[PDB]
Design a protein around this ligand. Structure first.
Ligand SMILES: CCO/N=C/c1ccc(OCC[C@@H](C)CCN2CCN(c3ccncc3)C2=O)cc1
Ligand SMILES: CCO/N=C/c1ccc(OCC[C@@H](C)CCN2CCN(c3ccncc3)C2=O)cc1
Ligand SMILES: [Cl-]
Ligand SMILES: [Cl-]
Lengths: 48, 297, 97, 245, 245, 297, 49
């Protein structure tokens, strides 16, 4: 969860709204096991 | 650094689990030593104090005059692998034609071996068990007949798409493991590793799987632990049209490379459900045979 | 790192690019809530937009620490302090800051 | 010299002049989780003395007709002292326990209680009597708290298993003509290095009269059984706000 | 390289890109009580990570007319987290603190806050205005809890002493054109090795605007001041039941 | 033992209070060194950043061209003992004849030196103070006259019986320290050790002395700390009949072997009461003289 | 903006304990991921179609 610790402050002449972009990935202790098919199958009918 | 005395002389943190006992080798039963008449005051092997919680340490030699017996009876047949590495029935899947259950040509089996008493009672002797296993799949019609039918078995781990029909896209099986075999071929057979996220599966989980108020509705999840839920086993006739014959697949499991911890009292009331130890209350039966009197055989 | 769709709410085609970022703006100083999301990487939701979440989809089990890096794209004159918190299992969605 | 004992831990001390030795469950002492077995990365908190101490939680009355009771760990302490607080603020918890059941009488009373520890003590229901109803025990029964819960059908330990074989678990007996207490040290038992003190009860404590209490009209008839216990090597991790369940 | 900093303790981390160094009160770091200074005999409990961490307790709004506020330690944490619980269950307590007051604005705002720490900050009353009434400040004013309390007469710090000389105490300034935070490490200060976290407030934190906030119509007018703090080397002793006051 | 890494590498417990600064000897004021014109870019002593919280480190030598000055001005007179070891009035006791206060020939003085501004303002510069003291007792009639009267002074520590009359049994003084002296004799004078149960007396205690709800009635005890209450000082004319003359005893205290910690802002509003820092709200005065404008002297 | 992933680690963001991690990374190699046979083509040979 993200909360305002203080407040977004800006002077006269600057926008009152800005955006944040979030990037994510795993640390170096990350590992996965037991291969399985993904839950999605991107196909509805036959692929021509 | 640490300077205050209580911190220096602290035990907070030793990971070494000091053990009171250790295992010794015992390939055969213990021998019996010669013994003679002892008429001593002070020494008294026969007297015990069961309140302590330990079994009696009195031996044959000290209770009667014994001869010498070199016992070479093997103890090999009572090892966990000897006891468990015998394949037994743990699941049945029906693929009927014009029936109620599966008239669509496929079937999904929740991987749970607790549906059969024999096998179940054996594993429930221990609380935690870690092992690999060999699964064998025997298929035939309901009369035990063999017909020229091709089948596909697929292991669908938690999170993978469960087939919803005989023609489901999931049978493309690009990553899941599948097995294609004919009823005419011998029983399909594969090895399965220890797949739990825990260090061991456990036949008993005295707890709930999630946080929150555990109201009546959710009381079905008491005792349910995901670490024991390995997934789904799906089977289907391999075709776009209904199969001409009804089928039955019997699943046999043979554990191997077994380790177990914490022995428990063995089940003594009929089993009723897979998920719990529920027993028939109006039918509590003694553990064994009874007799008319304590003074008569 | 790949972009996490924390703002996975709009769905009409013309507004899809909006899912790629969430906003912040002048508040009333009551330590108001900005956004929330589950940290479960292999679950439906924001993580589904990341390559990590997608690859994660091919494995039944996973183990490891994850990390999320937030980039502020407001003007150079804008300032501010935020409190980002991770609540381990058992803790309900935090009532207040 | 084996009938007399003193247990001191934290700011608490217990004495007994009629003991019958001490049992160390499965032959091993409680110990902190090693860096090899551990998996969570945050540095744990080990309160030590403020939580590893003797808590005297409950007293029951033994009667000529009592059936026996059970309590669950760590459920019994989740709302008590500094230990309870730590159990609530942290997601992860692990510890061992020193259990001391007390019950004294006179040299003219008789009776025997079996005091045992049963890991992963799952409770079952009588399934509607006929076994056709798939009923489940309510929260109040699976996690009875400090008050414990009385057994309905002792012979099968309310779980379809023979109490006659319960001695295969760490245990002691309180035979009034011999001792007035049982002491059992138990190490952390689970298939995971740490776990939730709230959602999972590692084991259950059972106190069941196998040989019924008896005495003659005129001897004190009120014979209490008191339960005292102390966590050992408590470790907690995964801090956050306090949660009761 | 002195304007940028990171404070990590427990499971909490603080960052700032406009700092002005760090003050270490009276030139010395917090430390546990030595076996020479100690007097109580019971072995203390040192929770460590579960209590020595950053707690963000309160936010105030700075206005062109604000007078200034004060908070008291350890009063502010007595009802928060695992720290609060330990403070309540134990008679004796001692710890140091790392205080981090936050307040950012824009390069077009101006104003200066004096952030200071005043040991044994006793509060006085205006004595009925004429000085003939021997009034005393109520509990709510001497120990305001997490909400702090607004100063009535800043010039004399509501205690008959000049705020102009408050700089003789560990302090920093938050001058908006220079920094957006103050950080002060404080060691345990008292004439006794341990003391009650309930009956005695070792020191007070004062945040007072000396140079009034100002800006032009149109710039964000809501300028918060947030208080974050972390106990250091917390030690507790004299366990018993929990007490709130 | 300790085996888990985090415990071995822990700092939990070091009692060594690492200090950032240490004291150097300084019998005299610092000398001034010769300096010349510096026209450098990069070096800039004059510029400071008061926000940091430290005083300016700029020195004479770097702000202007200075000559050499060997400064031998002593710093001895500003040591705590030099500042405090000067006896000042801290208490007055009246023993009148036909009055209201003490017409019984005796008097009990609560040992508290906060009744006199001069002395009080000085000690309140510090928060904690530890010291021994020399007390001198000057007695005479209200006109400063000396008469042939014998007096008894007695120190009654907390817990000892306070005399309730000129003839009270407590004056037997079998254990308490008493002093017998005539008004004609020179002022009685004794040495008093550091008697607190604490390591230091403290002129400020931001707290309550006991647990419980701190309701209005008990708000008088806010700031009261027993460690500062050394007892009662009782005096009486030595007789079974009323004294023929009215008396006054002025108590002077001279601290010695002084140690102090934590400097504080110095009192700038008139004192009103012994027990607290209460000030007259309708009369808050600036700390010093004022002027008409900032641009005029 | 640089274009590199964050180099911040657990140890520097919170107080951590020591953990000897022996979790294998073998199952995520290209051969482990791809060397699983999957359907890629179907051929029909009907009679009267
Ligand atoms: C190509 C497809 O071939 N795959 C065959 C197959 C066979 C078995 C597979 O997994 C078997 C896992 C079982 C050994 C786990 C049995 N257990 C673990 C503990 N447990 C359980 C059940 C109920 N309550 C508690 C525990 C179980 O039922 C997976 C794939
Ligand atoms: C034979 C009788 O002679 N005894 C003379 C005598 C004189 C002084 C004695 O004790 C003097 C103790 C004072 C130096 C303590 C003054 N203090 C200590 C701190 N304190 C105080 C007062 C108000 N608020 C906080 C602290 C004080 O007033 C005892 C006996
Ligand atoms: Cl409690
Ligand atoms: Cl809290």
């Amino acid at each position: 969860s993200i909360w305002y610790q203080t407040n977004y402050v800006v002077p006269i002449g600057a926008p009152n709204t800005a955006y944040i972009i979030a990037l994510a990935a795993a640390q170096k202790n990350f590992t996965m096991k037991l291969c399985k098919d993904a839950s999605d199958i991107l196909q509805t009918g036959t692929i021509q | 650094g640490d300077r205050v005395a209580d911190v220096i002389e602290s035990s907070i943190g030793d990971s070494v689990s000091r053990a009171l006992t250790h295992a010794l080798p015992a390939p055969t039963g213990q021998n019996t030593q010669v013994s003679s008449h002892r008429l001593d005051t002070g020494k008294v092997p026969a007297l015990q104090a069961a309140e302590i919680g330990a079994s009696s340490n009195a031996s044959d030699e000290s209770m009667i005059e014994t001869r010498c017996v070199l016992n070479s009876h093997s103890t090999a047949e009572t090892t966990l692998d000897s006891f468990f590495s015998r394949a037994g029935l743990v699941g049945e899947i029906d693929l009927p034609l014009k029936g109620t259950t599966n008239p669509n040509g496929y079937a999904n089996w929740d991987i749970d071996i607790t549906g059969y008493a024999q096998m179940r009672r054996k594993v429930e002797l221990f609380t935690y068990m870690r092992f690999d296993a060999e699964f064998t799949f025997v298929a035939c019609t309901p009369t035990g007949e063999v017909v020229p039918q091709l089948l596909q078995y697929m292991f669908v781990p938690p999170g993978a798409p469960k087939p919803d029909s005989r023609e489901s896209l999931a049978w493309q099986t690009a990553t899941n493991p599948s097995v294609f075999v004919k009823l005419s071929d011998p029983p399909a057979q594969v090895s399965v590793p220890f797949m739990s996220p825990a260090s061991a599966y456990q036949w008993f989980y005295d707890g709930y799987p999630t946080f929150g108020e555990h109201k009546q509705e959710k009381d079905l999840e008491y005792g349910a632990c995901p670490n024991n839920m390995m997934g789904t086993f799906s089977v289907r006739t391999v075709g776009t049209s209904k199969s001409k014959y009804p089928l039955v697949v019997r699943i046999y499991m043979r554990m191997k490379h077994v380790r177990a911890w914490i022995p428990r009292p063995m089940r003594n009331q009929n089993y009723l459900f897979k998920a719990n130890p529920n027993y028939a209350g109006n039918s509590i039966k003694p553990t064994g045979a009874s007799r008319t009197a304590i003074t008569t055989l | 790192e790949t972009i996490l769709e924390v703002n996975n709410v709009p769905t009409n085609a013309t507004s899809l690019m909006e899912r790629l970022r969430f906003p912040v703006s002048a508040q009333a100083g009551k330590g108001e809530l900005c956004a929330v999301f589950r940290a479960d990487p292999g679950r439906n939701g924001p993580w589904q937009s990341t390559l990590l979440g997608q690859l994660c989809g091919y494995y039944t089990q996973w183990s490891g620490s994850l990390e999320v890096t937030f980039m502020f794209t407001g003007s150079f004159m804008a300032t501010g302090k935020m409190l980002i918190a991770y609540t381990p299992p058992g803790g309900p969605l935090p009532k207040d800051r | 010299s084996d009938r007399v004992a003193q247990l001191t831990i934290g700011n608490s001390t217990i004495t007994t002049q009629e003991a019958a030795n001490i049992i160390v469950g499965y032959g091993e002492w409680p110990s902190y989780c090693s860096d090899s077995d551990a998996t969570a990365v945050d540095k744990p908190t080990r309160p030590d003395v403020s939580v590893n101490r003797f808590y005297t939680l409950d007293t029951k009355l033994w009667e000529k007709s009592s059936k026996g009771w059970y309590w669950k760990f760590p459920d019994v302490l989740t709302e008590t002292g500094v230990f309870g607080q730590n159990a609530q603020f942290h997601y992860l918890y692990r510890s061992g326990f020193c259990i001391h059941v007390q019950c004294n009488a006179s040299k003219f009373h008789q009776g025997a209680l079996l005091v045992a520890v049963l890991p992963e003590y799952v409770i079952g229901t009588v399934a509607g009597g006929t076994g056709t109803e798939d009923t489940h025990p309510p929260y109040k029964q699976t996690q009875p708290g400090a008050d414990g819960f009385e057994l309905q059908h002792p012979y099968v330990l309310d779980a379809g298993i023979p109490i006659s074989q319960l001695t295969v678990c760490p245990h002691q007996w309180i035979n009034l003509r011999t001792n007035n207490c049982a002491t059992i040290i138990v190490p952390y038992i689970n298939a995971l290095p740490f776990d939730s003190a709230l959602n999972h009860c590692n084991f259950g404590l059972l106190v069941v009269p196998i040989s019924p209490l008896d005495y003659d009209q005129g001897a004190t008839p009120v014979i209490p059984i008191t339960i005292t216990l102390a966590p050992m090597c408590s470790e907690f991790a995964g801090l956050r706000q306090a949660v009761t369940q």
